[PDB]
Design a binder for this molecule. Structure first.
Ligand code: TA1
Ligand code: GTP
Ligand code: GDP
Ligand code: MG
Ligand code: ZN
Lengths: 412, 153, 182, 426, 182, 153
């Protein structure tokens, strides 16, 4: 029934504090109410401390807040092997101590930031140690994969080609939200050149609320977590769909809010609104899980979608007749009291697997090579319990992820 | 099936002394022979043993039979040492008093069976040493009498 | 052994592979019906019957352990010297469109091992040992013979020593009525 | 986390006074007083530079190494001079001769053990050590020689903790010493092989940047020092503050050093406007990147425009949009694709603290790893040969127990170091 | 021995070096697969396997101590008489673009030592000693023979002295029926 | 392996007296032979020993074998003394009653083993001195009788 969550890496923790905020906010549980149902991991104390100093301070147990005073290191190796190792046990312990206390759970919603040290590496083995300790569950990892041109870390790809290959054979469904492609939404669909990280977080903090929160919440067309991976992954590769939200209108500027279904659903497939720089440049969808929430008439959907199924310029895979999982919830969304999110009475958090990422992975793989081609910051990992193996052998890994996402599509 | 002369600890010491060399022996430990034997460690031991006894080299473990007719010869060299290793162990282990050797012994070793084998080899190796002394003494006697021949003609 | 020389994404080559597998199974008494058609996308259950059959040519009477095949099958290909890693997830989806080409290729490579190993059971020297033995073929004969005796409770080795001296007289023309007749 | 500053030589020392003059105020620590901190955040992370004893006396955890009393006796007899526990003063009343050899093999080698002693008392302080900060000048005895030894020993004692080095590489135009290239070439040698992050500052790159970027007409040393100390505060201490995207010595190290040499950077501060007038506030952000990335404004002597970059780390510290930050960096990376090296898709390492420099609204330290610094070790290396060839003031070295092969060694080494760096400019 | 005569920054010469290394490894039964491709930028782990192999031709059954290779490898090249210092930091980055040319060069020089040393185990005089011995080849023979006897418990050396006098009569035609017959 | 006649202190004194000369011997100390022997000090000792016994010179340690076929002959002279040193020590140490000498003894010396070797050499050196006296006495006897020959013809 439940779904634990492990927010790993400063980012996965910032986003965590955010997604965790939106929660109580739409459940009437102020600062000090019940008890969360997740944990927080980081090898840099000062960040988890922010959850220990700032807002939502006492809504957590100093037990579900793991820290390694030591060093973060923007390098996979160190975070996965060398350092990150020391903490893992302890980490697990909570996701085994928190996993027990419950009643027939469904899985762990993992929150990490692909291209980091504590986020890429660590998790790599966290999800790793999970796939074995609970192979019998769902492993949906919600990632924030590398901005297409606006990356931060100098190594980023090293850290992301490595978190992909190690987690690939362990996740159930990996959701992806592109940090940059979300900015566009903040520039083009909300207008603000002042987007603090605290915003992107409010956003995913939204799209995510549509996943677990409301879905695990009764409705006219419930959709379990398992449901996802089933209706969402055509193949064992921990396939990565993309998150998209519909009413991303500004709560100040424009106001046409009352945008009946027929509209908000069409607003999902236009590439300028998908929290991912993977513009459907060719990527044929192969399965979409349209999660609606608020006042929505099933016919409105079983029509708004029909209209789409016949737009053709939206070309769905061949081997897939119908790939539209319609998830209907009741309670409308719940916008921050005064952030910058419109606040409509219905939304569409549609996520999907698109042959599109054939790109995004490509463009991120290429990156890697360029540097590896010169070993660039390699000495930083080797000296951290890794080898020419793990790199070269994780490169070959993704290689067959560029072929995979190619074969499962583009062909009939 | 009598009891093996040696347990794993002793077996390591005899392999170091008599079969493996330098780094190879120094790296060899109990845990890569029991309770689950690392097939690639046994490969090295069984191979070195054969080399010592039959005077044979690494290269001989890469011989390709002529009537195989495979399509990609270069893709098969990973398998050659196994195939040859098996063919020779067929002939050698009966000498070391082991008659029930099977291909699965190389591909998927069991603790007790492989400790029985290594004892049999180690035993035989101690015996041929005793024979070497006798043999080399006779050899020195005849090649020295073949010299007192050319020194007399 | 690093980059695959094989045209794995050429339809004809994958079709050639399937043909070889089909032929081999039929010609070696495989118990279940197979055809070019039935081998385009086998079920995992089928694959495991086929793999078990082929591998049994190397390990007589072999059955794969009742769980963890996704670990075992790849391990076996590794231990046989297959130059290319087979992923855990390949194993769950062996018959799938972008997967079967790699797997059928692997099976046909295994068939090639069988061929090599079968030829090896017909025909495929070391005269000096690297611990100072000369005429090793003579020493080994001597040593083996002594061992049989020893293993029979014998305490001395006169028979074996006598025979060794006979052969050493012939290897260097020398005795008593030769070395002292001069 | 933590670090332990090291004031090698006079310069490195003089600067200590300025680095601590600043940092303290950027942490509300009065002479011997405690934390008067205008805020409450300038305390949760202080540890990085102090120690708890009394309850109002957080003492800087640095080392003051020097063979010339008068110096430390000027730093200890002035302003903040009375905050260092006397134990910190590792003096060498000997003759602090201006010879690299006199402070690395003969005179300094003695005072070393009595230093390492303390560098251990401070390291084994508490919590977890990160690395050590090292200030000095590569143009003298107590600086290049003895300080370059202090590290060679440090890096044998904790090849784990990092080693940032702040070197005052011999300014071009005019050398404030004569053997300079001798004391220098010899210390850079030791650097390229122990510390793993070096920030090279040039007394004349400063003047310039201090007389034209600060209409300042009488730039006393105190100033230069002050400007420098401003950068080293943005680097370390800063990142030991919160941030949307914070980093720390390692991130900085693990994002800036593609190849083990250690490589040297060139720090640059952001708001560098003259007092009254200039107080233009054009600091929205494009103004800071405008700054930081220009030629002038690079504390180094060489000009970036003269050689690609390998890595860059804009360590900003003042509330801004992870969008207008992450964005700007890009155009910058495209307007100058020419010089920014290609085999690194994203050279830049954007870092973002929150709280800014006490009295300012928005700043951003720049730590550039450009191939341009090739054209400096060249300089140095040249000066050497031109004088080595004639063994100029060599008797002051050898006569101090040195080797004719020692000088050869260094030059070559550091000389090769020039070579390599070009391997990327191409 | 001071300035390197070798074209270390000529691509062809470094390629020539790699070829020599590749050839040598393959032709001397090196256990791991190598190719012109695999030797362009070896890992430190690889280098250490290659170095250990080569050096083992000089020190049979040699393994490098489990820590401090960055100190050891250079020390060994020094003690073998390699004219050029190999830095500690070279050792951590052996495969790197500006480093491998120096290291491959060093390995090929080591291979040349092996060649020299192997030839030396076939073929490569002092008739007078610098402490006044004349006909040292005769003295050494005498001295060695006396030592064997001595080492056997012998107290006198009549056999050896007698044999020494036989040879001294032949070296200067002289005895009794010669010096007094005149 | 019996016990070495001398400990390191005595070994130094015998090397000074009988093998090294002037500065070379004066510089020789316990700590460069134990507990870790300076291979270049042993090189000098082993080399001088060979010179004394075989009447051989520094130049002989730089002989290049003819069928080596190296590409840069001048780059190899650092190695030549080692290679030759080893080739001769092969023949000499068995004479001084040492049979287990290995190349690693020069390249990487151990305290005890090298003190065993130096004792064996020092012992033999004392013995050939005793033989020198006997030999030179016979030599003087025969070259003096070859003179009473030309003084009589
Ligand atoms: C009324 C007002 O706003 O005054 C400003 C000011 O006029 C200007 C010109 C300051 C001023 O700085 C200088 O004039 C200067 C003098 C020598 C060397 C270098 C700089 C200022 O003195 C410097 C001072 O800086 C700080 O307070 C920072 O926290 C800074 N602190 C110190 O450097 C420091 C100085 C004395 C004692 C202790 C610390 C800092 C920067 C980075 C990291 C840590 C601390 C500021 C904003 C000002 C004055 C006071 C006029 C500027 O410099 C800095 C470092 O902020 C020079 O260009 C900038 C722009 C500022 O607007
Ligand atoms: N959406 C979003 N992205 C973030 C946030 N914080 C960081 N990121 C992104 O995630 C990546 C940064 O990872 P880091 O903060 O460097 O590292 P980490 O993953 O927390 O772990 P360490 O490297 O060990 O510190 C960059 O690509 C950032 O753009 C956040 O709050 N929200
Ligand atoms: N920025 C700066 N440079 C200094 C200071 N003092 C000396 N220098 C520089 O340091 C060099 C001289 O070395 P010095 O510090 O006297 O050496 P030491 O005292 O013998 O170790 C010259 O290049 C000076 O410009 C200073 O307080 N600030
Ligand atoms: Mg972090
Ligand atoms: Zn409206």
């Amino acid at each position: 029934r439940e779904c634990i969550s492990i927010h790993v890496g400063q980012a996965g923790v910032q986003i965590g504090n955010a997604c965790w905020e939106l929660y109580c906010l739409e459940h009437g549980i102020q600062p000090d109410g019940h008890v969360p149902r997740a944990v927080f991991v980081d090898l840099e104390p000062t960040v988890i401390d922010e959850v220990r100093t700032g807002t939502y301070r006492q809504l957590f147990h100093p037990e579900q807040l793991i820290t390694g005073k030591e060093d973060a290191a923007n390098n996979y190796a160190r975070g996965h092997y060398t350092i990150g190792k020391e903490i893992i046990d302890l980490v697990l312990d909570r996701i085994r101590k928190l996993a027990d206390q419950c009643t027939g759970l469904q899985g762990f919603s993992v929150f990490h930031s692909f291209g980091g040290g504590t986020g890429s590496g660590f998790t790599s083995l966290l999800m790793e140690r999970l796939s074995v300790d609970y192979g019998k569950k769902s492993k949906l990892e919600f990632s924030i994969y590398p901005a297409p041109q606006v990356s931060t870390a100098v190594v980023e790809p090293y850290n992301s080609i490595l978190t992909t290959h190690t987690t690939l054979e362990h996740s159930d469904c990996a959701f992806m939200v592109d940090n940059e492609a979300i900015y566009d939404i903040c520039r083009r669909n909300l207008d603000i050149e002042r987007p603090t990280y605290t915003n992107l977080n409010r956003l995913i903090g939204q799209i995510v609320s549509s996943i677990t929160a409301s879905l695990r919440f009764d409705g006219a067309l419930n959709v379990d977590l398992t449901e996802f991976q089933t209706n969402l992954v055509p193949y064992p590769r921990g396939h990565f769909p993309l998150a998209t939200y519909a009413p991303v209108i500004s709560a100040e500027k424009a106001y046409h809010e009352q945008l009946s279904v027929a509209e908000i659903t069409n607003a999902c497939f236009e590439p300028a609104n998908q929290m991912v720089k993977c513009d459907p440049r060719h990527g044929k969808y192969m399965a979409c899980c349209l999660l609606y929430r608020g006042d929505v008439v099933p016919k409105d959907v079983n029509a708004a979608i029909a209209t789409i199924k016949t737009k053709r310029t939206i070309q769905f895979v061949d081997w897939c007749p119908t790939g539209f999982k319609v998830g209907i919830n009741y309670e409308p969304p719940t916008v921050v009291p005064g952030g910058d999110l419109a606040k409509v009475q219905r939304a569409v958090c549609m996520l999907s697997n698109t042959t599109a990422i054939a790109e995004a992975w490509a463009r991120l793989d290429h990156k890697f090579d360029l540097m590896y081609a010169k070993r660039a910051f390699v000495h930083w990992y080797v000296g951290e319990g890794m080898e020419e193996g793990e790199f070269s052998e994780a490169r070959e890994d993704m290689a067959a992820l560029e072929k995979d996402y190619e074969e499962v599509g583009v062909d009939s | 099936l009598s009891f093996p002369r040696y347990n794993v600890a002793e077996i390591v010491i005899h392999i170091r002394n008599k079969i493996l060399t330098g780094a190879d022996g120094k790296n060899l430990t109990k845990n890569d022979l029991y309770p689950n034997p690392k097939p690639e460690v046994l490969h090295m031991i069984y191979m070195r043993a054969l080399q010592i006894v039959y005077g044979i080299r690494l290269e001989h473990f890469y011989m390709m039979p002529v009537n195989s007719g495979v399509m990609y010869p270069h893709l098969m060299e990973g398998f050659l040492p196994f195939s040859n290793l098996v063919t020779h162990l067929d002939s050698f282990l009966p000498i070391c008093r082991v008659n029930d050797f099977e291909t699965a012994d190389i591909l998927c070793p069991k603790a007790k069976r492989t400790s029985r084998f290594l004892s049999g080899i180690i035993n035989f190796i101690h015996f041929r040493e005793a024979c070497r002394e006798t043999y080399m003494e006779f050899l020195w006697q005849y090649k020295s009498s073949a010299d007192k021949m050319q020194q007399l003609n | 052994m690093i980059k695959d020389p094989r045209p794995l994404n050429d339809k004809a080559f994958i079709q050639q592979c399937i043909r070889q597998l089909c032929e081999f199974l039929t010609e070696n008494g495989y118990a279940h019906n197979v055809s070019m058609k039935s081998l385009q996308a086998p079920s995992v259950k089928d694959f495991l019957k086929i793999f078990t059959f082929l591998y049994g040519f190397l390990c007589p009477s072999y059955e794969l352990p009742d769980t963890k095949f996704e670990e075992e099958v790849p391990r076996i290909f590794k231990d046989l010297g297959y130059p290319f890693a087979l992923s855990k997830s390949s194993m769950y989806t062996v018959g799938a469109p972008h997967t079967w080409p790699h797997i059928v290729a692997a099976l046909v490579w295994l068939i090639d091992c069988i061929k090599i190993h079968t030829a090896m059971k017909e025909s495929s020297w070391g005269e000096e040992t690297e611990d100072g033995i000369m005429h090793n073929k003579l020493f080994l004969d001597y040593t083996i013979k002594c061992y049989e005796s020893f293993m029979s409770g014998a305490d001395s080795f006169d028979e074996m020593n006598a025979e060794l001296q006979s052969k050493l007289k012939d290897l260097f023309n020398v005795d008593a009525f030769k070395l002292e007749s001069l | 986390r933590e670090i332990v500053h090291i004031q090698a030589g006079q310069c490195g020392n003089q600067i200590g006074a300025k680095f601590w003059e600043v940092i303290s105020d950027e942490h509300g620590i009065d002479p011997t007083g405690s934390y008067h901190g205008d805020s409450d955040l300038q305390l949760e992370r202080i540890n990085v530079y102090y120690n708890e004893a009394a309850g109002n006396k957080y003492v800087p955890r640095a080392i003051l190494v020097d063979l010339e009393p008068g110096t430390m006796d000027s730093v200890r007899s002035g302003p903040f001079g009375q905050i260092f526990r006397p134990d910190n003063f590792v003096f060498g009343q000997s003759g602090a001769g201006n010879n690299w050899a006199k402070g690395h093999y003969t005179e300094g080698a003695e005072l070393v053990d009595s230093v390492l002693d303390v560098v251990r008392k401070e390291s084994e302080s508490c919590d977890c050590l990160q690395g050590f900060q090292l200030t000095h000048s590569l143009g003298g005895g107590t600086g290049s020689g003895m300080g370059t030894l202090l590290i060679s020993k440090i890096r044998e004692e904790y090849p784990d903790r990092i080693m940032n080095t702040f070197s005052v590489v011999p300014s071009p135009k005019v050398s404030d010493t004569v053997v300079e290239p001798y004391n220098a070439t010899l210390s850079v040698h030791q650097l390229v092989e122990n510390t793993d992050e070096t920030y090279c500052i040039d007394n004349e790159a400063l003047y310039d940047i201090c007389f034209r970027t600060l209409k300042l007409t009488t730039p006393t040393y105190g100033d230069l020092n002050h400007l420098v100390s401003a950068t080293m505060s943005g680097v370390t201490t800063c990142l030991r503050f919160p941030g949307q995207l914070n980093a720390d010595l390692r991130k900085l190290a693990v994002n800036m050093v593609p190849f083990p040499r250690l490589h040297f950077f060139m720090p640059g501060f952001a708001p560098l406007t003259s007092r009254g007038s200039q107080q233009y506030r054009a600091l929205t952000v494009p103004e800071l990147t405008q700054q930081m990335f220009d030629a002038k404004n690079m504390m180094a002597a060489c000009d970036p425009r003269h050689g690609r970059y390998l890595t860059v780390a804009a360590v900003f510290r003042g509330r801004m949009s992870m969008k207008e930050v992450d964005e700007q960096m890009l155009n910058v990376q495209n307007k100058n694709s020419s010089y920014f090296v290609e085999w690194i898709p994203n050279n830049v390492k954007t870092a973002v603290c929150d709280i800014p420099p006490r009295g300012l609204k928005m700043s951003a330290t720049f730590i550039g790893n450009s191939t341009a610094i090739q054209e400096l070790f060249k300089r140095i290396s040249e000066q050497f040969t031109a004088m080595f060839r004639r063994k100029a003031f060599l008797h002051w070295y050898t006569g101090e127990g040195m080797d004719e092969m020692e000088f050869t060694e260094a030059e070559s080494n550091m000389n090769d170091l020039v070579s390599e760096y070009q391997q990327y400019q191409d």
